[PDB]
Each structure stands twice: as structure tokens, then as C-alpha cells.
């Protein structure tokens, strides 16, 4: 799949492959071409690093294309989310660990080891290499324009280690606030206005009643996705023993990442009791 990237939200979060977690489409598409075809200090330090750079440079390239060559925050976050997954793969915390990823894990184990002391060497190797992998993902974005280049994306913000489930809630919440206005804008067009003099269009108008079943189907996947992701967060936070600086509930992660995040409305939105939804899709 190191060819091109499916359009944003062409495919939603996959909560079925592994039942305990939802996986975003970007994680599947993560380019691991060279990292699989690998079949002695130089075994890891020089060779494995080059292989990971060749993959990171591609990911950083197709992600720039995914974002229509826009050099904005939406692009930097795709870099941040993907660079982390590269790390969880190296550090043995890849939550998916399915299919082609199983080959990469076996490749890394035949390099570092298999015991507890191997994760440390791998976690250490990621720390002393994560910076260089970020410069690789920024390759295409930096080659493209020799001049006029700016460090829009920042390094330490991307190489800050954080449990994988955290960074996926960040990506999810960013997808939710982008999708909600759309599913509402569609609802507004077909349901605004009053039908006769005081009744709502959804009571009788099929066109409006249909846009509601589309939103009803969408918001239900969001509620369910939030349920799984927040439960998987509680399982990890309880098992890690690290304080991760001010995050207790998964709602804190959205407050940090989202601007003007009103979790009161968020709870209302995903539970179909918000204001706009009642005015448009609830008759009585």
C-alpha cells in the first residue's frame, strides 16, 4: 500500500478486526515496505535505520499528497500520528500486530532479542533514532520548496512518547469535529424550515427523514467508536503506572487537542440529545 493514500474518511475506524480497540484507516496504510523485506552492531544501527528511513520518507511523502500538498496543521498531525505508530512498532507496543505487522515484529526480534531486556534496547534505540525518523518524513515537504521553507511541524511535539491509545483518541477527536458540521449541514438543507405553520419537516417529509437515518447511522458509529476507544484507554492507563502529565479521563485528551471543546455538548451529540438534532430529526 506504499503507493497512494485513500481519501480522508473514505474508510472509517475499524472496531471489528481486534474487538478491544478501533483502528484508523491511516494505521493500516502506514508504509512498511522496506521494514518487511529485511531477510553485529551494524545489523540494527546502520541497516535497520536506513530501512526505516526509506519507509518514513515515503509515508511523509504520501501524507503530503493526501493533504493536497497543503502545508498546514492537518498535515503535521498526520505526521505526528504516523511517526508514533512507527515507534510503537519498534517498541513492541503496536496495538494492531496483525498480518504484515507480524513479519516486522519477527524481524525486529531476530535483531534485538526476545526478553524484557530487549524491549529496553528497542525503546532506547527508538529514543536515539526517533528524531532522525522525523527528519525523514519531512524529506519531501522540505525538498519540494528549497527556499521559503518553514518548520510548520515541530519536532519535540512529534517525538514525545505517549501511549498509542492516547494519540489515536487525538486523531479520532479531530475526525469527529471535522465530520460533525458536514452531517449537520446536510441535515439543515433538507430539514430547515417548518412544513405547514408550526410542525417540523421530519414528521412527514421523507427527504428529511432519510438524512436523519444517515446521521443516525453515523452518530452511532461515533458513539460506539468512542465507547471502545475510551474503554481501551482505561485498560492501558490502569496497567502502565506512569502519570503522563495531567490526563485522567479520555475526555481530557479531547480538551487538550480540540479548541473550545465543550464535552457537555459532545456527550449530547453522541447521545442524540443535542439541540440541533431535536429541532431537525425529532418530531415528538
Amino acid at each position, epitope marked *: 500500500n506504499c503507493n497512494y493514500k485513500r481519501k480522508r474518511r473514505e474508510r472509517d475506524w475499524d472496531c471489528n478486526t481486534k474487538k478491544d480497540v478501533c483502528i484508523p484507516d491511516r494505521r493500516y496504510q502506514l508504509c512498511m515496505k*522496506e521494514l518487511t523485506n529485511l531477510v553485529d552492531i551494524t545489523f540494527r544501527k*546502520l*541497516y535497520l*535505520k*536506513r530501512k526505516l*528511513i*526509506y519507509d518514513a*520518507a*515515503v509515508e511523509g*511523502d504520501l501524507l503530503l499528497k493526501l493533504n493536497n500538498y497543503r502545508y498546514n496543521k492537518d498535515f503535521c498531525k498526520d505526521i505526528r500520528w504516523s511517526l508514533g505508530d512507527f515507534g510503537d512498532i519498534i517498541m513492541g507496543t503496536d496495538m494492531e500486530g496483525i498480518g504484515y505487522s507480524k513479519v516486522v515484529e519477527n524481524n525486529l526480534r531476530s535483531i534485538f532479542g526476545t526478553d524484557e531486556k530487549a524491549q529496553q534496547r528497542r525503546k532506547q534505540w527508538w529514543n536515539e533514532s526517533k528524531a*532522525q525518523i522525523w*527528519t*525523514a518524513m*519531512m*524529506y*519531501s*515537504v*522540505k*525538498k*519540494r520548496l*528549497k*527556499g521559503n*521553507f518553514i518548520w510548520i511541524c515541530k519536532l519535540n511535539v512529534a517525538v514525545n512518547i505517549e501511549p498509542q491509545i492516547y494519540r489515536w483518541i487525538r486523531e479520532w477527536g479531530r475526525d469527529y469535529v471535522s465530520e460533525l458540521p458536514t452531517e449537520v449541514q446536510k441535515l439543515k438543507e433538507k430539514c430547515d424550515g417548518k412544513i405547514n405553520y408550526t410542525d417540523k419537516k421530519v414528521c412527514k417529509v421523507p427527504p428529511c427523514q432519510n438524512a436523519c437515518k444517515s446521521y443516525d447511522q453515523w452518530i452511532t458509529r461515533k458513539k460506539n467508536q468512542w465507547d471502545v476507544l475510551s474503554n481501551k484507554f482505561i485498560s492501558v492507563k490502569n496497567a502502565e503506572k506512569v502519570q503522563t502529565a495531567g490526563i485522567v479521563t479520555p475526555y481530557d485528551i479531547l480538551k487538550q487537542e480540540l479548541d473550545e471543546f465543550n464535552e457537555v455538548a459532545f456527550e449530547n451529540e453522541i447521545n442524540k440529545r443535542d439541540g440541533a438534532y431535536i429541532e431537525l430529526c425529532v418530531c415528538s
Partner: single-chain antibody, 227 residues
């Protein structure tokens, strides 16, 4: 706008030393790698060394490790490369070039104008090619699996008199200014450049470049000239 300006032509006596400058203009030197390559009048392009900034610890070619020393001066925003024990066959034109965004990549982007100094290869290309306006031509590059097999390939359009320019990188991708008629491909142990619709601006010698895992250095091909 990012320029590289080198020092004037120098003439030395066999056995002496020579120091060439290379100044950046339009971007902080502190981020670039600043490699160097030379080309004798009769021979082709050869890579000497460079400063791998991501790791420090500059690297050099094989039978050059005892003659080249790269220095730097952040105040003057320039790089210096010194050659000692100058032999008669070291007469050539010396270039400084960088990838500008590469960590372990060598798809050079910004080249200097060269410096005239007066005192085979792992990759194998076809000795020469020839074509007529409007046809497809295919220059091929062939090497072992330790240089082209497991690493990306680049292509260069060098017009003698001027400095080479990046034509293709990562075996498939073309820069902005490169025409759409150019295109690259790689498979197994051989890459190939393709010019769909040979026009008049093909008056150049074409080289392929890749990274050799066994040599730990940048290697160039023999060369190929179209007409």
C-alpha cells in the same frame, strides 16, 4: 532562492594542496549536508565525500581517505574541501552539492557552478545513445543488489560547461521544473530512465546514482550521452 557559490579557479604544482570554498546564500547552512563530487574532462562524475549532518562524522570515498578534509565556518556561511598530495590526474572540476532535505538521501538538489583545478565504477551504463526528435529513448542503469537492489536511484542531466541538475529521485519521482516527458523506473537490479518525445534540449551526459550498502558511500555510473 538558495545559491551555492564557489571560489575561483586555482592552479597547483603536483604534490601541493588546494582548498575550495562553497558558500550558501538563502538558507541556514546549519541544516544541510554539503557533499562534493568532481569530474575530469575525459572521465565521468565521481563522488568523493560529504558531511552527514544528521550524524556528523563526515564520510569519504575509498581511495580518497587520506587526501580529503572537509572544514566549515558558520560565520562566512560556507564549506571548505582540501585535497593533499595532488597528482597529475586530479585535474578536474570540483562541485559542492546537497540534497536539501535528505537525512540518509543523496538526491542532490543545489549545486555550485564548479571550480576548475589544474595541476571504473560499480554502476554500469550503456556507453552511448542516440535518438531523433519525437521518439522514445531508454537509458539503463545496472548494478549489484547492494547498491541499486535495496536503495533508491537518482538521475542527473549534466551539460558540460554547467553543473548537473537533479532529474529523478526515489526511482519514480520527478522535481517541479523537470518536464513531464521524463520518467524513471526500477526493478530488481536495474533502473532505467525514459524520455518520451526526444526534443532538442537533450544535449547532456546522463548518470545514475545510488547508495551502496557494502561500500557505505555514494556511487555513480559510467555515463551516457544522447544526440
Amino acid at each position: 532562492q538558495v545559491q551555492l557559490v564557489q571560489s575561483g579557479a586555482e592552479v597547483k604544482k603536483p604534490g601541493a594542496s588546494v582548498k575550495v570554498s562553497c558558500k550558501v546564500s538563502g538558507y541556514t547552512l546549519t541544516e544541510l549536508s554539503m557533499h562534493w563530487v568532481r569530474q575530469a574532462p575525459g572521465k565521468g562524475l565521481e563522488w568523493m565525500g560529504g558531511f552527514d549532518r544528521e550524524d556528523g562524522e563526515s564520510i569519504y570515498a575509498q581511495k580518497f581517505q587520506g587526501r580529503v578534509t572537509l572544514t566549515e565556518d558558520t560565520s562566512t556561511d560556507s564549506v571548505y574541501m582540501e585535497l593533499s598530495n595532488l597528482r597529475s590526474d586530479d585535474t578536474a572540476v570540483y562541485f559542492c552539492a546537497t540534497d536539501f532535505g535528505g537525512s540518509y538521501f543523496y538526491a542532490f538538489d543545489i549545486w555550485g557552478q564548479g571550480t576548475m583545478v589544474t595541476v571504473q565504477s560499480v554502476l554500469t551504463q550503456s556507453p552511448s545513445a542516440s535518438g531523433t526528435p519525437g521518439q522514445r529513448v531508454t537509458i539503463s542503469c545496472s548494478g549489484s543488489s547492494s547498491n541499486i537492489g535495496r536503495n533508491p536511484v537518482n538521475w542527473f542531466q549534466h551539460l558540460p560547461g554547467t553543473a548537473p541538475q537533479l532529474l529523478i529521485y526515489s526511482n519514480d519521482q520527478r522535481p517541479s521544473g523537470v518536464p513531464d516527458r521524463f520518467s524513471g523506473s526500477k526493478s530488481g537490479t536495474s533502473a532505467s530512465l525514459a524520455i518520451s518525445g526526444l526534443q532538442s534540449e537533450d544535449e547532456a551526459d546522463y548518470y545514475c546514482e545510488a547508495w551502496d550498502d557494502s561500500l557505505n558511500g555514494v556511487v555513480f555510473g559510467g555515463g551516457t550521452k544522447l544526440t
